[PDB]
Every structure is written in C-alpha cells, then in structure tokens.
C-alpha cells in the first residue's frame with residue numbers, strides 16, 4: 001500500500017510517548033546505571049526502584065526507537081545514540097531531558113500549545129502557577145539548573161562571541177541579564193583593561209559572584225542585583241544582551257533595548273548575541289525548537305534578520321553590523337549584532 | 343564532528359514540541375482549511391481565530407518537519423505526509439491526534455510517565471480527576487469520540503476476525519465489552535443462525551442499540567448494560583473479548599477470563615482479539631505505542647505470546663489455538679486466540 005510510509009512518518013512525528021520515554025530514561029539515569037553494570041531489567045529496577053515489568057515496557061520502546069539494544073538475552077546496552085544520555089557526555093543531553101531540571105520541566109508547557117497559538121501568550125504559568133522567571137525565583141534549585149544548562153557549552157556561550165569583538169576602545173562593559181557572568185569573564189580575560197558589570201536577578205547574582213570569585217575576577221567584574229526594565233545602574237561603552245531579548249515580546253524587547261540605548265557612552269555599542277536567521281532560512285529545527293520554547297515558556301520569540309532591522313529602529317538604534325560567528329563546536333548558526341544610536 | 347548525526351537523532355526523538363505541533367495542527371484542522379483554500383498565514387489565522395504571528399511560528403515547524411511546504415511566497419500546502427491530516431482521510435489520523443478527542447486527550451497522561459514506571463499504575467486520574475472509563479462515563483462526548491476512533495477501520499476491527507472463525511456450531515454469542523456492537527454485527531451477517539448479545543457500559547449501549555437498529559439487526563443482536571466483573575448475563579457457545587483484556591492488569595484480566603469461563607456452554611470457546619507478539623518480536627513501535635498507552639491510561643498491558651499461555655492457565659483455560667489474522671489494510675499483526683476449558 002502506497003501511503004504506509006507517509007502514515008508511519010506522521011505517526012512517529014505525532015507520537016507523544018516517544019519523547020516522554022526518552023525524558024523518562026534521562027530522568028531515571030538509566031543509561032548511567034547500565035554503563036555502571038546494571039544490564040538486566042531486574043538489576044536496573046533495583047537501581048532505580050521501579051517496578052520490573054513496567055521498566056521492561058519502557059526499555060522495550062527504548063530498543064524500538066534505537067536508544068538501547070538487547071546485547072545478550074535479557075541484557076541491554078546503549079546504542080551510539082543512547083550513549084549520549086550518559087550524564088557526563090559533553091552535549092549534556094541527559095540534563096536537558098531531565099524532567100526534574102528546569103527546561104524539560106518547562107517543556108510540559110507544550111501540552112497547551114493550542115492556547116499559545118490562539119493568544120500568543122505563554123502557558124507555563126497555567127501549569128506551574130507563576131510565570132517562568134518568578135517560578136525560578138521561588139525555586140533556587142530550578143534557577144541553578146537553568147543557569148547550568150544554558151552554559152553547558154562555554155565555547156559557544158562565552159568564548160566565541162568574546163573573541164569576535166574588538167575591545168580596544170572599550171573601557172566599561174555592562175552585561176545585561178548576564179547569567180553567571182561567563183560572558184563578562186571571557187571578555188575580561190581577553191581584554192585586561194576592561195572593567196565589567198553583570199546585571200542580574202536575585203539568586204543568580206550569588207552564583208555569578210561565586211563564579212567570578214573562583215575565577216579571580218572579583219576586582220574587574222562586579223555583580224549588581226537589578227531589573228533591566230528600570231534605568232541601568234551605570235553607563236558603558238559596550239552593553240551585552242546575550243540570549244536576553246528572545247525571552248520577551250516585541251514591546252518588552254524595545255523597552256530593554258531603549259534602556260540600553262539610554263546607558264550608552266558616546267561611541268558605545270549594544271551587542272546582541274542570538275540567532276538571526278533570514279526568514280527564508282528559518283524553517284529549520286534549531287530555529288523552531290528555541291522559538292517555540294520562547295512562545296510557551298515566556299511569550300518571547302526568536303527574531304529573523306528582517307525583524308532585527310525593525311526592532312533596532314523602534315529603540316532609536318541602527319544595526320551597524322551583523323557578525324556571523326564561527327561554530328567552534330556543533331553547527332549552530334549564531335550571530336553578534338552590533339547596534340548603534342540612530 | 344562524528345557524533346552530530348547521533349545528537350540530532352536523540353534530540354528529535356526527545357522533542358516534546360514536535361508531537362504537540364502535529365496535534366495542534368490536527369486540533370486546529372489546519373490541513374482541512376488549507377485544502378479549502380486558505381493558504382496564507384493571514385487567511386488561516388482568520389479561519390482558526392489564531393494570532394497571525396503565532397500561527398506562522400507553528401507553520402514554520404510544520405514545514406521544518408515536512409508536513410507543510412511553502413509553495414509560493416507566503417503560501418503553504420500539505421506534503422504527502424501532511425495530507426494525512428485531512429479530516430476524511432481513511433487513516434483518521436486527524437481525529438487520533440485531536441486534543442479534544444478522547445485518545446490525544448488521554449495521551450497527556452504520558453507527561454507523568456516516570457510515575458507509571460515506578461508504580462505500574464495509570465496517571466490519567468492524576469491529570470483528569472477520574473480513572474479512564476469513569477471519566478468517559480461522565481463525559482458522553484468523549485465516550486462517543488473514543489467509540490468512533492477504535493472502530494475507524496471496520497475491516498480490522500470487525501470483518502477480519504468474524505471471517506476467521508467457523509460459526510457453524512455456534513448458536514449464541516456473547517460479546518463482552520463489545521463497543522458499538524460492530525463485531526457482533528459482523529458475525530450476525532456471516533452466520534444468520536446466530537443470536538448475539540453485546541454486554542457494555544452505560545452510554546455505549548445506546549450507541550450500540552442505535553447502530554444495530556440502523557443495521558436491521560435488533561432482532562438478532564441485543565444489547566445489555568452491565569459489568570463484566572459480575573456474573574455474565576447469560577451463557578454462550580462463543581464469548582468474545584475483543585481489545586478488552588489489554589485494558590486490565592493481570593489480576594483483573596484473570597477475573598474477566600474466569601467470568602467468561604463460567605458462562606461457557608459445553609464445547610464453547612473464548613475468542614480473544616488482540617496483539618500477541620512473541621516477546622522477541624515485540625520490540626516494535628506498534629506494540630510499544632499501544633502497550634504504553636495501556637500503562638498510563640489504565641494500568642493495563644499488551645500480552646506477548648508467552649504471557650497468554652500463562653494467563654489462560656490461571657483462569658482454568660487452555661489456549662486451543664492462535665489464529666494469525668490476515669492484514670486486509672495496513673500491516674498490523676493481530677490474532678484471534680481461541681481458549682477452551684482446561
């Protein structure tokens with residue numbers, strides 16, 4: 001029958017149990033326990049305190065989708081794909097799929113995706129009771145998990161964009177929504193003359209200070225607790241917005257950009273570190289995953305190249321330059337947009 | 343980099359937004375509206391009352407995963423795979439993925455899959471407030487949706503198993519949990535001498551009677567409202583359990599089989615219509631989808647061939663024969679197990 005291939009393709013794409021099986025495996029640390037020697041259902045059930053027959057039924061789907069394989073009778077081992085759920089694999093995919101950590105927990109928001117397409121508004125609060133960052137504020141453990149996930153690739157998060165900008169004429173940097181201070185730290189290492197300030201939320205500021213202290217950068221990078229919708233705590237030659245604006249709908253993104261514009265020294269620049277696909281190039285799974293997460297988590301959005309041109313104008317800014325960043329690790333197209341006063 | 347293929351494979355398998363995007367498209371009847379002439383985002387937003395920019399973002403992922411394609415600038419059409427979401431396509435995949443119909447609604451149970459692997463118990467009640475069939479009992483609209491989904495393929499559901507059994511020495515049939523009476527009806531057509539009784543729950547009995555009335559079979563197939571954990575309403579030469587036992591854990595399945603055994607005429611047989619994969623043949627997506635749905639919806643289970651041998655023994659029965667059924671439509675391996683008193 002001619003449509004069976006198409007049918008199977010649709011059913012697979014539409015299957016909700018398959019990603020939940022992957023995330024359940026991640027959460028139970030199943031692959032770690034297997035690598036440590038528990039290859040049978042009875043051994044793995046003991047290690048995870050799960051019911052043996054129910055665990056077998058989970059394992060059966062993990063084999064069907066190619067994450068595990070039955071090596072000997074009743075003995076299971078990870079495939080090349082399944083091995084990526086080992087806890088210390090550099091892609092950190094176990095943590096990214098762990099239902100007790102911030103992102104896979106937030107992904108439950110997708111169960112109300114129709115509401116988000118109707119309203120353009122996030123569904124996270126309807127599930128967890130508070131909007132995303134307020135929820136993280138009330139759950140320091142989730143805050144910590146979130147901060148660690150985002151920084152899982154330091155070359156992409158911090159080193160590549162720091163290396164792609166000329167800091168020679170920069171004296172002061174303000175990193176707005178700067179997380180644990182990784183970006184500010186990478187700049188400081190490359191540009192010894194720079195002093196930097198990280199503006200962040202409660203909880204994150206302590207992680208940031210502790211990180212910078214560990215790095216021996218406390219004297220060059222300070223951390224300020226604050227709200228980037230209010231006047232910024234000081235002026236700067238370079239103001240960093242690294243994966244900040246995508247958290248926000250257009251009217252909020254403009255407010256943040258305007259606060260940054262108002263804090264620029266003469267000759268200063270605003271640096272945006274984000275995706276910037278041309279619209280015609282944006283129909284890809286990397287763009288849509290992050291963009292749709294921003295919708296249901298936060299009501300934010302990824303902006304295509306043509307939108308960035310528009311957003312800058314509204315904040316009294318102009319796009320001076322868009323620097324296509326190298327991909328030092330995985331092929332993941334990122335840019336550094338450089339904005340100047342209009 | 344050598345692991346990028348494996349990484350992409352894992353990320354796709356683990357993606358929760360992708361099936362929710364498919365189910366959102368199904369629920370919004372997007373493909374139907376496109377086929378009817380709404381090919382632009384602005385036309386489709388009007389037809390679905392969704393926010394245009396949010397709908398574009400949904401459509402972008404539908405293109406990325408190959409369900410839609412951009413035909414002309416800003417105009418979208420279904421692919422060969424996407425066309426299967428048309429409402430009248432025989433595979434009924436739009437309805438099976440519609441979040442307001444019974445099954446895709448029940449699939450939200452998978453968001454608590456770790457609890458089900460730990461306990462072996464369903465998560466449906468924890469989401470919807472009542473166990474599965476009690477919830478359907480309180481929502482006649484969902485009951486109706488459920489009954490219609492299961493019967494979407496009448497050749498597989500009713501005609502094939504009816505044609506695969508010799509009714510010559512059968513005078514009375516009892517179809518236990520017989521749904522709308524489709525199986526009983528198919529037997530009645532093939533075996534004019536048979537009288538049949540459908541035992542079902544409230545609500546379903548009215549649909550059954552109405553269906554049989556429409557079929558002109560009221561005089562040969564009657565419908566009884568009842569509970570198959572209680573003594574069965576009469577004796578029979580053939581007792582049908584078509585996709586019933588998988589709804590139930592082993593101890594409940596044995597109780598049902600025992601009630602059936604207690605209602606058999608001399609020489610009678612119990613006919614089980616279900617999957618019966620050998621365990622070594624069960625590591626496939628058809629088996630696991632249904633098996634894992636039974637776990638989280640109901641705490642039920644698919645039984646492999648070797649389990650059926652064991653279950654029959656416990657009910658005072660013996661497997662006389664397992665008839666591998668033909669697949670008149672899609673390749674979906676089903677059997678008719680014939681059980682006799684031990």
Ligand SMILES: Nc1ncnc2c1ncn2[C@@H]1O[C@H](CSCC[C@H](N)C(=O)O)[C@@H](O)[C@H]1O
Pocket residue numbers: 133150151157176177178179180183199200201204226227228229241242243244247
């Ligand atoms: N109103 C607000 N004021 C200051 N920071 C805020 C804020 N709302 C959200 N944030 C911060 O915005 C950050 C976005 S995550 C970005 C982290 C970092 N710039 C990186 O590239 O890795 C979060 O750390 C969050 O704490």
Ligand SMILES: Nc1ncnc2c1ncn2[C@@H]1O[C@H](CSCC[C@H](N)C(=O)O)[C@@H](O)[C@H]1O
Pocket residue numbers: 475492493499518519520521522525541542543546568569570571583584585586589
């Ligand atoms: N306690 C009970 N007594 C009688 N029927 C029950 C029951 N619990 C569940 N059922 C029925 O069991 C059926 C399982 S669905 C099976 C439908 C049909 N035999 C077919 O093959 O298509 C449902 O229709 C449900 O109403």
Ligand SMILES: O=[N+]([O-])c1ccc(O)c(Cl)c1
Pocket residue numbers: 007008011627628631672674
């Ligand atoms: O083709 N498949 O892989 C497939 C999977 C699950 C199903 O329920 C059906 Cl009907 C088919």
Ligand SMILES: O=[N+]([O-])c1ccc(O)c(Cl)c1
Pocket residue numbers: 090091092096152153156329330
């Ligand atoms: O999947 N990710 O999120 C991810 C990000 C960066 C990486 O270097 C790798 Cl290897 C993986």
Ligand SMILES: O=[N+]([O-])c1ccc(O)c(Cl)c1
Pocket residue numbers: 103150243247290293297298
């Ligand atoms: O889940 N993510 O990939 C993700 C990335 C960046 C974010 O700011 C948030 Cl809030 C989530």
Ligand SMILES: O=[N+]([O-])c1ccc(O)c(Cl)c1
Pocket residue numbers: 149150151152153156157290332
């Ligand atoms: O999509 N993300 O959220 C994400 C997060 C961290 C990364 O290094 C990369 Cl490359 C991507």
Ligand SMILES: O=[N+]([O-])c1ccc(O)c(Cl)c1
Pocket residue numbers: 150151153156157158242243290
């Ligand atoms: O994809 N993101 O949203 C994201 C956020 C923070 C980061 O450091 C990186 Cl590298 C990526």
Ligand SMILES: O=[N+]([O-])c1ccc(O)c(Cl)c1
Pocket residue numbers: 159163190
């Ligand atoms: O050329 N350098 O001095 C230099 C310094 C830091 C970097 O990350 C890179 Cl990539 C280069």
Ligand SMILES: O=[N+]([O-])c1ccc(O)c(Cl)c1
Pocket residue numbers: 285286289330332349350353
């Ligand atoms: O390789 N991919 O397809 C892919 C998709 C989403 C991601 O966040 C990343 Cl990091 C990679």
Ligand SMILES: O=[N+]([O-])c1ccc(O)c(Cl)c1
Pocket residue numbers: 432433434438494495498671672
């Ligand atoms: O996917 N299904 O559930 C399904 C079942 C029976 C069919 O004939 C077809 Cl075509 C599809």
Ligand SMILES: O=[N+]([O-])c1ccc(O)c(Cl)c1
Pocket residue numbers: 445492585589632635639640
């Ligand atoms: O979702 N399903 O495929 C499905 C099939 C049969 C059932 O009895 C139930 Cl309860 C669900």
Ligand SMILES: O=[N+]([O-])c1ccc(O)c(Cl)c1
Pocket residue numbers: 491492493494495498499632674
């Ligand atoms: O898996 N199911 O639930 C299911 C339902 C109806 C069918 O015709 C088939 Cl073939 C399969």
Ligand SMILES: O=[N+]([O-])c1ccc(O)c(Cl)c1
Pocket residue numbers: 492493495498499500584585632
């Ligand atoms: O797969 N099932 O569970 C199922 C249930 C009822 C049916 O009529 C058919 Cl054909 C299949």
Ligand SMILES: O=[N+]([O-])c1ccc(O)c(Cl)c1
Pocket residue numbers: 501505532
């Ligand atoms: O040979 N017959 O008489 C007959 C009757 C009904 C059927 O469904 C089939 Cl398949 C065959």
